[PDB]
Design an enzyme around this catalytic site. Structure first.
Site, PDB file in Angstrom:
ATOM      1  N   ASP A   1      -6.853  -4.824   1.342  1.00 60.45           N
ATOM      2  CA  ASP A   1      -5.056  -4.854   1.361  1.00 60.45           C
ATOM      3  C   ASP A   1      -4.127  -5.846   1.750  1.00 60.45           C
ATOM      4  OD1 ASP A   1      -2.628  -2.717   0.755  1.00 60.45           O
ATOM      5  OD2 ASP A   1      -2.768  -2.292   2.810  1.00 60.45           O
TER       6      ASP A   1
ATOM      7  N   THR B   1       0.571  -0.594  -1.359  1.00 55.35           N
ATOM      8  CA  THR B   1       0.825  -1.092   0.153  1.00 55.35           C
ATOM      9  C   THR B   1       0.149  -3.041  -0.178  1.00 55.35           C
ATOM     10  OG1 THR B   1      -2.041  -1.359   0.496  1.00 55.35           O
ATOM     11  CG2 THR B   1      -0.532   0.779   1.866  1.00 55.35           C
ATOM     12  N   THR B   2      -0.555  -3.235  -0.952  1.00 58.29           N
ATOM     13  CA  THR B   2      -0.861  -4.340  -1.016  1.00 58.29           C
ATOM     14  C   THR B   2       0.142  -5.044  -2.170  1.00 58.29           C
ATOM     15  OG1 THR B   2      -2.714  -3.879  -1.547  1.00 58.29           O
ATOM     16  CG2 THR B   2      -2.469  -5.902  -1.819  1.00 58.29           C
TER      17      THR B   2
ATOM     18  N   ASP C   1      -3.339   8.564   1.829  1.00 60.86           N
ATOM     19  CA  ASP C   1      -2.627   8.223   0.461  1.00 60.86           C
ATOM     20  C   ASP C   1      -2.828   9.677  -0.420  1.00 60.86           C
ATOM     21  OD1 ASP C   1      -3.993   5.871   0.081  1.00 60.86           O
ATOM     22  OD2 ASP C   1      -5.535   6.081  -0.211  1.00 60.86           O
TER      23      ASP C   1
END
Lengths: 508, 72, 508, 517
Positions: C48, C81-82, C382
């Site tokens: 990430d 996120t990424t 998560d």
């Protein structure tokens, strides 16, 4: 081919007329400065030049953008007169004006109408202070006279100005509805007279009389000849080559001396004592023609009898073979007038007639050259002063009025191009600015004040930048026909927007 | 700042104030030339007379200092 | 004059685009993880962006902005996120061009910022509602959204823990935002993923009580934010150093105080005392603390003040810095307060139930080792976040950037109908989208270009008759194997990026 | 030598392609700002015309090769359209970089440009299907010669030119034949006239006149004696011309050469005609005999013009003096020596109301730059006019067609899921550069300016009105009458779209570098 993109193209568009314009803007405007042409690419020389082309053409014009105006400004001078220095600076002004607007990142197209429409309303404001001076002939006299003296100005003319302001108007006041370059006959020679010139009664001609010929001819009826003799008279048998060797080379010269004599047969048939012809004869020929007893005048000028036939009422014709192919010209005298050391065979049939000969005596040709153009320029501005006798206030006062209005206009007139119209209006007051420091005077106040001052209605009061003073354009005599000023506005406004819209230049 | 043509919006507003229209101005929300009706685009008279002042002063005031001796 | 800002803006957007580009390989699970030797010269291994972008970062302000932009998506959704890193340069690919193309920076901002809402609005069309009231559905969908992603490992067990902890602190059927504010994540060394469990009161650091009863039920929760100690010189016992009777007598000073200061602690009375760490103290008199717990108040010392801060709110134990601040309100009311050393290894005071605002949950994260604890946390985080997003966003959306491949078409389509200077932008705006799932189609391996191009038509057909299915990494329905995410991570990445891209355009 | 491949060639092709699109883009259309262009010769040419720019450029590369080539197939048939076909080819190539930079092979996009080149010309087809007959189209011929005379800025009051181009095309090129006649249209002009001095000559004007005005200005219907034969110095092509070297030779030749021309000018009239057109003219000696023999005839006729006055009039061929016969003669509806209003421009017209096989537009102008200003403008007019007088299919120009295309193009582009889904869509993006570069020239921001038309297309979804092409501020395709023949716009594309794709199929090039042309 060399592709020139807009960066240097607009730049080169700017440099060309500016780099020449600075040279002529010295000469042009009022006079605080001129161009002294320091001449060497062709020679060792030192020259003094108020003439645009003499500044333009002599120096390398090689800039493709400078090609335009050097070509375009000359025509404007070749058309209405004194357009070289004019179309050059004024567009060079716009080049500065464009340059900012360019550097302001503005479409040249956006700049086009901004100037081009501003060109109109300025020419309109030019037409305002254009004031018709045709009222009487004395008005038209002094109008033309003020206008004749207007174009002659800012140039080196010794005795020229005051005589031609008489002559140019004289040439005008005889033709009545135009001026006469068809009439004034410019005769140039070495007379020892400084610039001194005069209206020539009849037309004088330059030859030494000698050999056996008595010099003066009285009660002379000229026999007009459009075809004289060069050395051998031309007809069926007129040519021969006998030369087989080097002796005949010296013996062939002797054979053609016979051909000088048969020329007498043609003229002796006509019978007139005075035979005036176009083609000259020499002194050894003078033996044969003078001993004939008839008087055969050589190199009698076409425009000379063209002066006569107009004023004498007679007919000068073409294609002369037998006496009556040209109606016989009538002069009172074929005489020799002696000016200093000169000997001038002088045909007087008439005096200061509606065709005049003008004898230009000077020790220098260049002044006689620049005197002809300013005369050539004035009569054109005088011939248009015959047409438009408006003499619009010059010396930058016109620029101001146009600069004030167009600025007032650009304020209201566009929603965008108020950029260029005032920029145009800015280029107007430019030509005023460069010459006031040349008197030492402050242009800024002037272009600020005297513009607004006389654009508030002093318009007669205007720029004397010879004195660096505020003075009356009509009373100072600084003013000129509404055309030439608008004419020098036409090309320069057009000269700039061409290379302005030129964004690329191919070079092979 | 609004990324619109100034010479347009200015010389328009020039032409607007050349027609003497101060009730029409550059409306910088959409960045056109448009009414100053007090759309909100109008300012209190206090600000400008104040803002019009010190820089129209200081710029001149700066023009007076010419010789500037910096002893550092 | 605005040159340098563009240059800076270039320098900004360049190093902006730059750092965001490197992740576009590591983007996604098939995104390749980089072992990175750092300024420490030592390997660092992550996929990430955020961790990657933080763990080695130099300083470029736009880059510094993006690691925040990276962190933003994290701190915003805890999720997707990424993704946010990839869209910025994608947008800037449009922007920099449009800037080169000349679109004014303020325009592109409000262009894409307007166009933002249109994208997520068509996303709301793409959006598929799942039940935020039904724990099962959330247990079903979020885990499936987690099964659209890597970790079901402890999750499919800990989603029963995550969805519940959330469901327990879920008041609404909407389940609203629900930050982890009411979910206390604490670990315990020993135990299991099964010994990981939700607990209904706040587990306190160990239980630090010396004479303090191992359990006190119905706990007044005392808080000691003030020192237990009499003044120091060389210890809690204040020692003036010459001869040992003074330091023996100043005890009578010191001893009585730490007794009375404690006697004052039991005056108002406390069943539990919250005591933060003694280094979160200046120091805590054991002399007091002995007689403190020797008056029989159960205590936890050595607890984080932020625990206390978590405890001051969630069980409503109001901060006590002082004995006037000893009060039944500032002394929290616990239903039950115990310690469990057991059910795994390690000791913790268990508040089980309490007087608590906003429900409350603590999950005590256990395992055969710390790692089994650690990934369990990473299994819930998560789940913890994807739920609180999925509940924050009434509907659900399939993942893999296929909605963008839909939406990139959708907005470009309307960006036509939009017209305006921004049509070029709002197309290029949407055009930025498909690059990201392309990069995934490259990151999973495929033609990133061929596929996503075709998917735009696939997404012109059923809008999903195909999508980017990560395990397939290719043209597939992403609903056949669900690749699915809450609406936020889509919105989140978008809403962040434009703003982060917006000001930069407005940044000089 | 060397072989440059792929990206090398890719940067070899678009590179030389990119710059010349730029010189024409600020030259583009009426607002396209003209380009002064100067040779090594001291020449100057102010050129917004791509073909003239291309004629001005010897610049070196296969691109610059193909460029000088590509426009001039548009410039003859269609005329106007010369500029857009090149600049847009660059714009297409301008795209293919980034589009191959997206990892789409140059032949992966290649069809997509041509594939989407279909919708544009197909969308152009939709614009105006109108076809009008000569007497009806003559207004649209001059209404288009409003535009197609417009770019050179010789247009209004030049409706002379506009109207003389109406008949000049019709006279030789039929409406039904639809086989181009620019060969039987005689483009003719002379310095010293004026732009507003303009004529369409139906037959052949021969520059020289009858040997005297003292003989009639007028030869009647036909009776044109087609002659290769000296009545002045022959300058024969078999032997060399020399003249009399002796004194007795000027005696005899004067006496000999007179009575033969007396006989021959009578023998011409014996064979018969009121006009003898002589490849080798009457001398001044033969002039007075043409007077003395009492015959009208032309002195000088061009060596080719002796065929011209034969073919262009349909006059039955008389090769020479020895082939003189009565039944074979050059033909005329009438013959005049016509002053054109500036006696400086003076021709002897052999005019055809019988059959005009070369129709003569005779332009006038103060000088050559001004007549060429008219002629290439009249050409492009005459071009589009002939195109229109064949089929009057028109289209509203200024890109509002392409702005309407590009949207429909890029849409229909996406429809094929093949990777040219995207690639065809980027094709449509190029369709917008010409009105763009025109809006630049218009003094407008093209970006917003096109979106006006975009909005106008969002309104209209075909051009009717539009933006400025001329710079005014009345933004119209129809009312501004920015209109092109529907044909050549498609021909622009067909010429513009493939050369790119053709250069796409040919990137394999043996060169040390681009400059090999």
């Amino acid at each position: 081919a060399d592709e020139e993109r807009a960066e240097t193209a607009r730049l080169t568009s700017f440099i060309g007329a500016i780099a020449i314009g600075d040279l002529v803007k010295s000469t042009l405007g009022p006079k605080g400065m001129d161009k002294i042409l320091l001449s060497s690419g062709r020679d060792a020389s030192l020259m003094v030049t108020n003439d645009g082309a003499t500044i333009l053409k002599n120096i390398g014009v090689d800039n493709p953008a400078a090609k335009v105006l050097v070509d375009m400004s000359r025509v404007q001078d070749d058309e209405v007169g004194d357009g070289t220095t004019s179309v050059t600076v004024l567009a060079a002004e716009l080049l500065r004006e464009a340059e900012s607007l360019i550097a302001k990142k503005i479409h040249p197209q956006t700049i086009i109408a901004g100037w081009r429409e501003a060109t109109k309303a300025a020419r309109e404001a030019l037409l305002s202070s254009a004031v018709d001076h045709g009222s009487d002939e004395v008005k038209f006299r002094q109008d033309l006279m003020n206008i004749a003296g207007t174009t002659l100005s800012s140039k080196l003319l010794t005795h020229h100005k005051d005589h031609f302001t008489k002559l140019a108007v004289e040439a005008v006041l005889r033709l009545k509805g135009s001026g006469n370059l068809e009439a004034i006959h410019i005769i140039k020679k070495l007379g020892g007279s400084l610039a001194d010139s005069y209206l020539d009664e009849g037309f004088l001609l330059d030859k030494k009389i000698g050999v056996n010929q008595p010099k003066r001819i009285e009660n002379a009826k000229i026999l007009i000849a459009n075809t004289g003799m060069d050395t051998d008279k031309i007809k069926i048998f007129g040519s021969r080559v006998r030369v087989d060797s080097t002796a005949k080379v010296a013996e062939i010269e002797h054979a053609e001396k016979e051909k000088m004599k048969e020329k007498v047969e043609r003229i002796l048939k006509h019978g007139i004592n005075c035979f005036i012809n176009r083609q000259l004869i020499y002194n050894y020929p003078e033996q044969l023609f003078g001993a004939a007893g008839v008087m055969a005048i050589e190199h009698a000028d076409f425009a000379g009898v063209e002066r006569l036939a107009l004023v004498t009422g007679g007919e000068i014709a073409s294609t002369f073979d037998h006496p009556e192919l040209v109606k016989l010209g009538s002069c009172k005298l074929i005489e020799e007038v002696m000016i200093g050391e000169d000997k001038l065979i002088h045909f007087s049939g008439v005096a200061l007639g509606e065709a005049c000969t003008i004898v230009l005596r000077g020790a220098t040709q260049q002044i006689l050259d620049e005197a002809e153009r300013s005369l050539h320029d004035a009569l054109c501005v005088l011939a248009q002063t015959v047409k438009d006798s408006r003499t619009v206030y010059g010396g930058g006062c016109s620029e101001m009025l146009m600069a004030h209005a167009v600025t007032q206009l650009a304020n209201r007139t566009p929603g965008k191009e108020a950029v260029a119209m005032e920029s145009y209006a800015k280029a107007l007051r430019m030509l005023p600015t460069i010459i006031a420091d040349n008197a030492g005077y402050d242009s800024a106040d002037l272009v600020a004040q005297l513009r607004a001052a006389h654009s508030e209605g002093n318009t007669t009061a205007g720029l004397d930048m010879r004195e660096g003073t505020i003075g009356d354009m009509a009373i100072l005599g600084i003013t000129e026909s509404f055309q030439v000023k608008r004419q020098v506005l036409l090309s320069a406004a057009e000269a700039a927007e061409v290379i302005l819209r030129v964004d690329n230049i191919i070079k092979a | 700042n609004a990324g619109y043509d100034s010479a347009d919006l200015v010389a328009q507003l020039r032409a607007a104030h050349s027609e003497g229209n101060t009730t029409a101005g550059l409306d910088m929300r959409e960045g056109t030339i448009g009414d100053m009706a007090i759309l909100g685009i109008t300012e209190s008279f206090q600000v400008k007379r104040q803002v019009l002042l010190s820089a129209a002063e200081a710029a001149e005031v700066i023009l007076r200092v010419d010789n500037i001796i910096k002893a550092a | 004059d605005r040159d340098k800002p563009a240059q800076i803006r270039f320098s900004n957007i360049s190093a902006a685009k730059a750092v965001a580009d490197a992740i576009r390989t590591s983007l996604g699970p098939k995104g390749m993880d980089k072992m990175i030797q750092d300024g420490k010269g030592d390997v660092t291994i992550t996929n990430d962006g955020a961790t990657i972008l933080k763990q080695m970062q130099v300083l470029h302000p736009a880059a510094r902005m993006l690691v925040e932009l990276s962190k933003a998506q994290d701190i915003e959704a805890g999720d997707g996120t990424t993704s946010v890193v990839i869209i910025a340069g994608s947008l800037l690919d449009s922007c920099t061009k449009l800037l080169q193309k000349g679109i004014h920076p303020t325009i592109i901002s409000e262009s894409f910022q307007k166009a933002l809402e249109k994208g997520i609005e068509i996303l709301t069309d793409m959006s598929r509602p799942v039940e935020l009231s039904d724990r099962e559905t959330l247990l079903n969908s979020a885990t499936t959204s987690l099964n659209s992603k890597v970790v079901s490992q402890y999750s499919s067990l800990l989603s029963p823990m995550s969805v519940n902890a959330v469901m327990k602190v879920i008041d609404p059927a909407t389940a609203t935002s629900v930050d982890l504010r009411d979910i206390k994540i604490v670990k315990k060394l020993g135990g299991t993923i099964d010994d990981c469990e939700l607990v209904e009161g706040l587990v306190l650091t160990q239980k630090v009580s010396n004479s303090g009863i191992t359990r006190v039920e119905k706990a007044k929760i005392g808080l000691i934010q003030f020192c237990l100690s009499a003044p120091k010189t060389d210890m809690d016992n204040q020692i003036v150093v010459s001869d040992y009777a003074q330091m023996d007598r100043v005890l009578r000073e010191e001893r009585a105080y730490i007794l009375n200061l404690v006697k004052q602690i039991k005056k108002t009375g406390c069943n539990v005392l919250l005591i933060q760490k003694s280094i979160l103290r200046d120091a805590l008199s054991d002399l007091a603390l002995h007689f403190l717990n020797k008056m029989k108040i159960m205590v936890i010392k050595d607890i984080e003040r932020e625990d206390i801060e978590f405890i001051c709110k969630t069980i409503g134990t109001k901060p006590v810095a002082h004995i006037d601040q000893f009060t039944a309100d500032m002394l929290g009311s616990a239903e039950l307060a115990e310690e469990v050393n057991l059910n795994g290894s390690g000791k913790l005071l268990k508040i089980t139930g309490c007087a608590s605002p906003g429900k409350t949950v603590t999950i005590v994260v256990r395992g055969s080792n710390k790692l089994v604890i650690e990934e369990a946390e990473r299994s819930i985080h998560d789940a913890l976040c994807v739920i609180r997003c999925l509940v924050k966003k009434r509907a659900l959306i399939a993942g893999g950037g296929a909605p963008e491949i839909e939406l990139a078409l959708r907005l470009t389509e309307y960006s036509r109908t939009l017209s305006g200077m921004e049509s070029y932008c709002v197309r290029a705006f949407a055009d930025a989208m498909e690059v990201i799932p392309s990069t995934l189609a490259e990151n999973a391996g495929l033609n990133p270009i061929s596929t996503v191009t075709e998917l735009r038509n696939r997404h012109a057909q059923g809008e999903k008759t195909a999508g980017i299915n990560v395990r397939k990494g290719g043209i597939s329905n992403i609903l056949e194997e669900l690749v699915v995410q809450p609406l936020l991570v889509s919105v989140s990445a978008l809403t962040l990026a434009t703003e982060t891209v917006r000001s930069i355009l407005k940044i000089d | 030598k060397s072989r440059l491949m792929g990206l090398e060639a890719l940067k070899s092709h678009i590179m030389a392609a990119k710059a010349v699109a730029n010189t024409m883009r600020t030259s583009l259309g009426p607002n396209g700002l003209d380009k002064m262009m100067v040779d090594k010769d001291g020449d100057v040419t102010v050129t917004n015309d791509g073909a003239t720019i291309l004629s001005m450029m010897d610049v070196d590369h296969q691109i610059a090769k193909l460029m000088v080539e590509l426009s001039k197939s548009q410039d003859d048939e269609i005329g106007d359209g010369t500029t857009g076909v090149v600049v847009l080819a660059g714009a297409l190539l301008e795209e293919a970089e980034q589009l191959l930079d997206r990892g789409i092979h140059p032949i992966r996009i290649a069809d997509g440009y041509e594939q989407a080149a279909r919708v544009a010309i197909e969308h152009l087809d939709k614009i105006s299907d109108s076809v009008l007959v000569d007497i009806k189209d003559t207004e649209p011929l001059i209404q288009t010669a409003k535009t197609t005379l417009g770019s050179k800025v010789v247009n209004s009051c030049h409706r002379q030119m506009a109207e003389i181009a109406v008949n000049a095309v019709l006279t030789v090129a039929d409406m039904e034949r639809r086989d181009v006649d620019f060969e039987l249209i005689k483009v003719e002009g002379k310095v010293g006239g004026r732009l507003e001095d303009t004529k369409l000559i139906k037959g052949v004007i021969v520059d020289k006149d009858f040997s005297h005005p003292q003989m009639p200005k007028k030869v009647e219907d036909a009776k044109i004696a087609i002659l290769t034969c000296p009545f002045e110095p022959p300058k024969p092509k078999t032997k060399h011309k020399l003249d009399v070297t002796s004194v007795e030779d000027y005696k005899a030749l004067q006496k000999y050469e007179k009575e033969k021309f007396e006989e021959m000018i009578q023998q011409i009239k014996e064979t018969g005609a009121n006009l003898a057109i002589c490849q080798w003219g009457f001398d001044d000696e033969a002039n007075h005999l043409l007077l003395q023999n009492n015959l009208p005839a032309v002195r000088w006729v061009g060596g080719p013009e002796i065929e011209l006055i034969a073919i262009a009039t349909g006059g039955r061929i008389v090769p020479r003096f020895s082939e003189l016969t009565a039944e074979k003669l050059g033909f005329a509806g009438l013959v005049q020596e016509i002053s054109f209003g500036t006696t400086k421009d003076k021709m002897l017209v052999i005019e055809q109301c019988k059959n005009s096989r070369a129709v003569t537009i005779f332009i006038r102008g103060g000088n050559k730059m001004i007549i060429e200003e008219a002629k290439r403008s009249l050409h492009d007019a005459l071009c589009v006019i002939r195109n229109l007088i064949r089929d009057n299919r028109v289209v509203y120009g200024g890109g509002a067609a392409e702005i309407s295309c590009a949207l429909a193009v890029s849409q229909e582009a996406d429809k094929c899921p093949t990777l040219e889904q995207y690639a065809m869509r980027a094709f449509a993006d190029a369709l917008e550069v010409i009105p763009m570069a025109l809006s630049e020239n218009s003094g407008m921001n093209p970006i917003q300016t096109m979106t006006e038309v975009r909005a106008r297309q969002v309104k209209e979804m075909n051009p009717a009105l539009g933006i400025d092409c001329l710079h005014k501020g009345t933004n119209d395709m129809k009312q501004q009458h920015v209109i092109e023949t529907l044909i050549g716009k498609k021909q622009q594309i067909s010429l513009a779209t493939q050369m790119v794709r053709m250069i796409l199929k040919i990137d394999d090039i043996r060169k040390p570098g681009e400059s090999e042309e």
